[PDB]
Structure 1
Amino acid sequence: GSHMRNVAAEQQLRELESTFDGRLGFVALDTATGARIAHRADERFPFCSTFKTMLSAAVLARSAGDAALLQRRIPYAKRDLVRYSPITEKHVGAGMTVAELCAATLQYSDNTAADLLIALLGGPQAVTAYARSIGDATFRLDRRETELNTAIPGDERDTTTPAAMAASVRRLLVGDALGTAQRAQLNAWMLGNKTGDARIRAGVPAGWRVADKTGTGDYGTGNDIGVAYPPDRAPIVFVVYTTMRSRNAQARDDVIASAARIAARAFV
């Protein structure tokens, strides 16, 4: 790639933001060189369900020191379900294994699965502590699903910055924050995501595999974070956060995909 392409890409991100009534937080990192394409990289955004990557990583880290954990099956009843639980609603009673809950919350954004895992770890503060332990001094998880999706302007609960999340995604999926085998498992889960086809995935070429996690919330908040793996180049980290002025707004898959496409084409 080139510096002039990266600078031009950053201008294109400004122009893309100028087309909608909201803000765009964007970081893409070419891990061949650390080259960055960014917009509003240090502003806080409500992360909505993209925190489920950090959650699942924390669970994997705990499993590395407990051989029984991934197969532990956590029971729950119908009345324990929270809204948007497409997988866990099928297994009320005996419930699902911790590994299955991680896969459900990553691949279908299942909220009861997320809340069961947050409780397993000792509450939202345990997820924040895990983030700190991998070098993320920005990330904060304050609430559970579904309250963490309120995305109120000026509220710092359940927020991070695009730069902090891109460094964490890099360290988790590409680097050495997890052991080799846990990293592989987290990648596999996110590569099998079912909710991201219209976001980062829609902005990259057919041969690039994308391990991503989406988030959607109030104020038309539309997010996607992850790593794209071109077949014969270093991985590229993508972090896309968008949120709108109006509380009632819809999320914009097309904007998210366009932001990803701008960086994908600039890096090659």
Structure 2
Amino acid sequence: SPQPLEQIKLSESQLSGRVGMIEMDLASGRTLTAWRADERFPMMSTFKVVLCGAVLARVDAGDEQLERKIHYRQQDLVDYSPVSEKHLADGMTVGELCAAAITMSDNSAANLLLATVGGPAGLTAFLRQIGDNVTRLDRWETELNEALPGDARDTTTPASMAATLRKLLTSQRLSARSQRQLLQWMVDDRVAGPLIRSVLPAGWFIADKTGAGERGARGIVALLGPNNKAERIVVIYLRDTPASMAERNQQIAGIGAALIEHWQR
């Protein structure tokens, strides 16, 4: 594989779409690679990690408990609720809802949690409170991944998302236990985690949350590194490409291959 930047450019050429990417040291925030890092991209399901960061902040403040059981109704369910549709009778705890939202991308779980933090406006206010003045959530699942061309709703930038994830995972804004919980939910991703491990060379750590939307929108927010360590945050978003999901996945994987082959930078 060629150098990361060369590969990213090649991916735009092949997809006919825009790619946004940041590679950042998790411990220090050092930015290693930045491409269209200040341009907007739909967050799609990647917003679920930020959502649960807001939930954990409420737990730390004593305003929420991960144990608290939420009971909901069938009429509350939206498209794609693999975990939540199974608990209409017994409900789910707030912690279970975050696990379902992050590890299974359960949309109803995400909407139930979104309501607890004040909806899209409440989550956006949380982002402003931690210093992210760019990322914004405007809608609920599943309308939020519509990805209309030029629509600023429900978007982030690679730089903002990377900085925000680092703040949630390491800045001590969240308690030690909460930081560890957010990380573990990403490590436990069932949608792409196992698949990514199956193609990663031995020794490479992966934790992640993916997203998909209309007009080719696709993305991933991840922790990656050799020697089984979460060394870097890697955020990659794609938008406005007519390519098959398989090809969008392959191009993102190709950027990862370039990082892996040329890690020491």
Residue 7 of structure 2 is aligned to residue 12 of structure 1: yes
- Mean Cα deviation higher: 84-93 or 224-233: 224-233
| Counterpart secondary structure, 2:223 | strand
Distance in 2 (CA, whole Å) between partners of 1:225 and 1:250 is 20
Is 2:150 the partner of 1:154? yes
Task: Report the Cα offset of residue 68 of structure 1.
Answer: 5.6
Equivalent residues in 2 for 1:1-268 (5 A)?
Answer: 8-31=3-26, 34-66=30-62, 69-197=65-193, 204-231=200-227, 235-246=231-242, 249-251=243-245, 252-268=248-264
Aligned equivalents of 1:261, 1:92: Cα separation in 2: 42
1:111: how far off?
A: 0.3
TM-score (norm 1): 0.89
Closer/same/farther in 2, CA of residues 233 and 122 from structure 1, 3 Å limit: closer
Cα shift readout 1:229-259 (whole Å, capped 9, x = no counterpart): 433767111101012344xx53311111112
The letter for the 2-side match of 1:26 is M
Q: Distance in 1 between matches of 2:47 and 2:230?
A: 25
* Runs of at least 4 residues off by over 4 Å: 198-204
Cα distance in 1 for residues equivalent to 2:194 and 2:33: 21
Deviates more, 1:230-239 or 1:178-187: 230-239
Alignment deviations for residues 136-182 of structure 1 (CA, whole Å, 9 cap, x no partner) = 11110000000001011100000010111111112222433322111
Unaligned runs of 5+ in 2: none
Q: Which moved more, 1:28-37 or 1:219-228?
A: 28-37
Change (3 A) 1:199 1:160: farther
| TM superposition score normalised by structure 2 | 0.90
Comparing 10-19 and 111-120, the one that deviates more: 10-19
CA distance in 2, matches of 1:87, 1:21: 36
Equivalent-residue separation in structure 2 for 1:234 and 1:193 (angstroms): 15
Secondary structure of the structure 2 residue equivalent to 1:28: strand
Secondary structure of the 2:152 match is coil
Note the alpha carbon deviations across 1:90-138, whole angstroms, 9 max, x for none.
Answer: 0013310000000000000000000000111111111111112222111
Counterpart residue type for residue 156 of structure 2: T
Letter in 2 for 1:238: V
What fraction of aligned residue pairs are identical, expressed as a percent? 45
Contact 1:25 1:241 in 2 (8 A): yes
Q: Is the 8 A contact 2:74 2:88 kept in 1?
A: yes
Amino acid of the structure 2 residue aligned with 1:116: L
What secondary structure sits across from 2:38 in the alignment? coil
Distance 2:196 2:236 in 1: 8
Which position in structure 2 is the counterpart of 1:4?
none
What residue ranges of structure 1 are gaps of 5+ in the alignment? 1-6
